Scaffold this active site. Structure first.
Site, short mmCIF file in Angstrom:
data_model
loop_
_atom_site.label_atom_id
_atom_site.label_comp_id
_atom_site.label_asym_id
_atom_site.label_seq_id
_atom_site.Cartn_x
_atom_site.Cartn_y
_atom_site.Cartn_z
CE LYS A 85 5.19 -1.20 10.35
NZ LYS A 85 5.03 -3.30 9.30
CG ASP B 245 4.27 -2.29 17.25
OD1 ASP B 245 4.43 -2.06 15.91
OD2 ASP B 245 3.04 -1.35 17.74
N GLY C 21 -10.80 -6.31 13.68
CA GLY C 21 -9.61 -6.36 12.64
C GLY C 21 -8.44 -5.15 12.93
CD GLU D 117 11.10 10.20 5.51
OE1 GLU D 117 9.90 11.07 5.66
N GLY E 143 -1.35 6.86 8.59
CA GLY E 143 -1.60 5.98 7.03
C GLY E 143 -0.45 5.68 6.11
N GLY F 7 4.98 10.82 11.53
CA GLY F 7 6.82 11.41 11.13
C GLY F 7 7.42 11.74 12.78
CB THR G 180 -0.55 0.05 1.13
OG1 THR G 180 -0.44 -0.40 2.40
CG2 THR G 180 -1.92 -1.42 0.81
CB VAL G 181 4.15 2.16 1.93
CG1 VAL G 181 5.09 3.55 2.05
CG2 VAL G 181 3.58 2.00 3.49
CE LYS H 87 4.51 1.75 16.42
NZ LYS H 87 3.40 1.52 15.90
#
Lengths: 392, 391
Positions: B104, B189, B175, B128, B289, B133, B12-13, B193
């Site tokens: 990521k 996760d 979802g 990025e 997104g 951001g 998608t990116v 970060k």
């Protein structure tokens, strides 16, 4: 090897003095690291004879702005003077003479920013100001007003008492009009609307009400209904038009803005598109503004040798109003008032009522197309006031 | 009239990056005198359907076709992975290609080694990610809610008064949670970060395993409701404190004072709260997104293209704990008195009923967890959570 970057400063208040000191403390680092020697060649002040710190007397002070504007050795003009007139004309001249401009002028509005941005692009120089798919923003944009509301709410004082306390603590100025009448917030709405929507509105296009009429009763009644009261600066960009306002607004207690207390500010941004975002922090002071100016200065110094929006309509990869209405001199029970409102209001999502004072009730109505104020007035109610209601 | 690029990856990116370039190509041409050509796109499988949906670009499965193409100016990597992805980027940089990555899985060790390798070769490295951001100092501390699924689960338990198991099944149904939700609920996760945020905030590299990590699967409704009565919410907090040259990083269930701006951050929203001097600041929002990441990549691309390829000097900590103890005989007053006797000096203590023969205490102003100490005095400690936002 090293090239001189010749600058001039227009104004030497706290912000200007801060810029000078920052340049001084960092001059060696900027020299040896970026091979640029920044020279403050002129400083424009209003009175060159008044006593100043010893470090200021190193620099050439002048009271004649033309001395600066006619000096072709200058690369960048840094304006920290304030004012529209004649300040803006000074900056126009600078730009026309192929000088980069960095300004932290707090009185500049969108009309001015636009005209300078264009004039700069036209002349191939930078304009740095230190004041998408965004459809709406809401903000707490004035520290003093928010401090006062926080104090009223937490310490259960009147507006008058909270305002005096804010004066005592340094948050409010002796003439606090600009803060408490929402003027400062309205200016920021103008600027934020310009940056968010790329549209220019005038200050007087911002529908504005301050906080001086907010009472403890409003706060406590809002509280019982599940809301806080904040002074909200708001811009909604619908069908080519920006609708901008500043006024006391009930905010649902679970909304992120509801938690923003005291002198903290926040800007809550809503988009087409992506999820909501918010930025939170205190109002910037002289040192931080000075710091931004020097940052901008270093950045432009690397501009040594556009107004573009990236279009994102690849997005094909895939607005009611709420009101708090206070009525007085009523006229029977809270149930009767509730029933009368249910009969008279056009369609809406929800209605709650509450006791406000003697013969006085409040209603929060969610999901109307428009203010029910006139309608309620035409049905024989004295409407004390109406505040918008935000959040969910 | 120009700028030859290649994309590594087309999810998608990547698809977003392509479409953004397409929509803006004319504007970028006529307004910045640069024609961006997407010369190659690396995909793992050329036979698999995607968005585009069928397109005009050269798709390849051979990364060497891209890395050996000396006409390329910039490599945009949106593929993910450490191996072999990082090596691909090292090669690109060594071949004097600018690199823009939205990967990521990169940690600080990787960002550091690529940043240096880039500077060494006189090319840009633009990183990025992610959201709340990451750029997009004088920072001494940050605290964040950095994982949407885990926060969603705690919000659901709190608001709807369900068990963790129920809230987790509901998150799967909606979802938000994956079928194996370990990465979210075990705090992995969030820990990644914290690593990245510590690198950007402190310019220090820590390893993922240096982050002291506890997930949310042990948080119960009782913890939530006891915390509630004491004036706190429970959040999974990723935290980095930079004291005396050392970063202390963690991710764990934490009581947060209800007035604290982080206390209000619910559901899948994230936030990063930054302390340093100045006021506190916070950025709030969901995990950015695909379209916004793509947008950042193209921004970075234009920036690198336009310029075709350092902090100033403005010079002019105790801990709080929520401790749960079980199999306590005697009254809450007796427990309180016994804790007062055994704890080292501290600022304050409050106790609460937790369950049958079980009490909780919030203790302010200790240097470290009183867990071992309380254990050595013969009590059964269930667990200890840090407490934040006091004052």
């Amino acid at each position: 090897h090293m090239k001189k970057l010749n600058i001039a400063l227009l104004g030497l208040g706290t912000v200007g003095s801060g810029v000078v000191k920052i340049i001084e403390e960092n001059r060696q680092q900027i020299q040896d690291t970026l091979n640029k020697d920044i020279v403050i060649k002129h400083i424009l002040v209003r009175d060159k004879s008044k006593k100043r710190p010893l470090n200021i007397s190193q620099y050439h002070l002048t009271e004649d702005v033309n001395e600066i504007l006619n000096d072709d050795s200058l690369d960048i003009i840094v304006e920290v003077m304030g004012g529209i007139e004649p300040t803006v004309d000074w900056l126009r001249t600078a730009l026309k003479n192929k000088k980069h401009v960095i300004t932290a002028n707090k009185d500049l509005l969108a009309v001015h920013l636009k005209l300078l941005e264009d004039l700069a692009e036209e002349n191939g120089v930078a304009l740095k100001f230190e004041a998408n798919n965004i459809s709406k923003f809401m903000g707490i944009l004035n520290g003093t007003s928010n401090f006062i509301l926080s104090k009223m709410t937490k310490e259960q004082t009147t507006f008058e008492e909270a305002l005096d306390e804010a004066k005592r603590l340094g948050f409010a100025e002796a003439d606090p009009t600009d803060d408490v009448e929402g003027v400062d917030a309205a200016r920021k709405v103008v600027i934020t609307s310009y940056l968010s929507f790329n549209q220019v509105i005038k200050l007087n296009d911002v529908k504005r009400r301050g906080i001086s009429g907010v009472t403890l009763t409003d706060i406590n009644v809002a509280d019982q209904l599940g809301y806080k009261i904040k002074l909200i600066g708001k811009g909604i960009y619908e069908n080519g038009k920006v609708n901008a306002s500043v006024e006391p607004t009930l905010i649902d207690k679970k909304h992120q803005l509801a938690a923003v207390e005291d002198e903290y500010n926040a800007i809550y941004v809503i988009g087409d598109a992506v999820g909501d975002t918010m930025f939170y922090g205190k109002g910037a002071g002289s040192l931080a503004t000075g710091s931004a100016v020097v940052s901008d200065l270093l950045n432009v110094a690397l501009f040594f040798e556009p107004p573009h929006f990236e279009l994102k309509t690849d997005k094909t990869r895939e607005e009611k109003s709420n009101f708090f209405v206070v009525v007085n001199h009523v006229k029977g029970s809270i149930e009767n008032f509730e029933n009368e409102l249910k009969a008279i209001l056009p369609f809406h999502r929800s209605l709650r009522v509450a006791n406000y004072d003697n013969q006085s009730y409040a209603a929060v109505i969610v999901g109307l197309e428009s203010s029910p104020e006139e309608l309620i007035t035409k049905h024989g109610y004295e409407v004390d006031k109406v505040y918008p209601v935000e959040g969910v």
